[PDB]
């Protein structure tokens with residue numbers, strides 16, 4: 001069961017860098033910061049331990065994580081570790097998304113934060129990596145706009161993404177607390193990104209919000225994430241616009257955004273032949289792996305090995321990679337296909 005799924009080549013399209021941290025790394029960072037007196041280690045260890053990861057509590061957890069991880073050398077470390085972890089379960093293509101941070105007291109700009117991410121990619125040595133333009137993994141980057149930001153700070157992220165297209169930035173995400181901010185703040189920056197040929201993925205429908213869901217669909221992003229609280233008119237529009245959905249099974253169940261895997265919309269989308277991609281979202285926060293997500297889907301839908309492999313391969317055309325990378329991915333999958341029957 002889990003062994004063949006672990007061996008399947010897989011494509012990860014929705015993984016937030018600071019949601020993908022090893023527990024042992026987070027606790028080590030906390031210990032060091034406590035020895036310096038920045039935090040009380042026992043309280044921090046407690047929140048990492050006890051936060052029930054309901055939707056409200058998840059964003060409190062991210063505020064704590066960011067207190068532990070926002071410095072250049074830590075960004076470099078966790079970038080390398082996340083790439084290693086995905087490569088070890090035979091992710092062959094990763095779009096890693098992260099919110100560039102500004103931290104004036106340590107001389108960190110959004111640009112230097114992203115330069116520390118690039119340094120993390122350059123530091124990968126346990127696997128072979130392709131990110132510009134023994135397992136091998138292709139990595140491309142999405143820069144996240146957090147819904148707490150302003151239009152002008154969102155525009156700084158978009159401008160930075162355009163400047164970093166040579167080191168594998170391919171797109172922009174809108175994410176962060178779905179209870180905060182207005183679509184009208186971010187639509188103008190996302191439109192600038194889209195008009196400059198960046199690919200766009202939007203977190204959409206994480207909470208009930210009918211006007212915002214319709215407005216995000218009308219923008220015609222290249223992908224959306226989650227789609228938990230769509231109504232029928234939203235599904236009809238989504239299916240007509242053919243926007244792929246990044247499906248986050250464990251996340252949606254843990255946050256109580258979806259009552260159970262057996263009603264999760266990924267099954268309706270699968271049966272309607274609508275593009276979907278199984279994703280981890282935050283494999284550290286939610287204690288999962290991409291192989292575990294596939295295992296949940298495979299059990300729930302009763303997929304054969306051939307159907308599972310076909311679903312995994314279908315994610316290629318939803319990537320934001322250059323066409324040459326997609327051609328390489330088609331070669332990788334077609335070459336592995338006979339082993340998954």
Ligand SMILES: CNc1ncnc2c1ncn2[C@@H]1O[C@H](COP(=O)(O)O)[C@@H](O)[C@H]1O
Nearest residue numbers: 016017018019062098099144146175176282
């Ligand atoms: C539960 N599902 C989610 N919904 C909305 N936003 C999420 C998220 N999971 C992660 N993020 C976004 O990703 C950031 C952490 O990684 P980075 O600091 O960018 O690497 C969070 O602060 C949040 O804005």
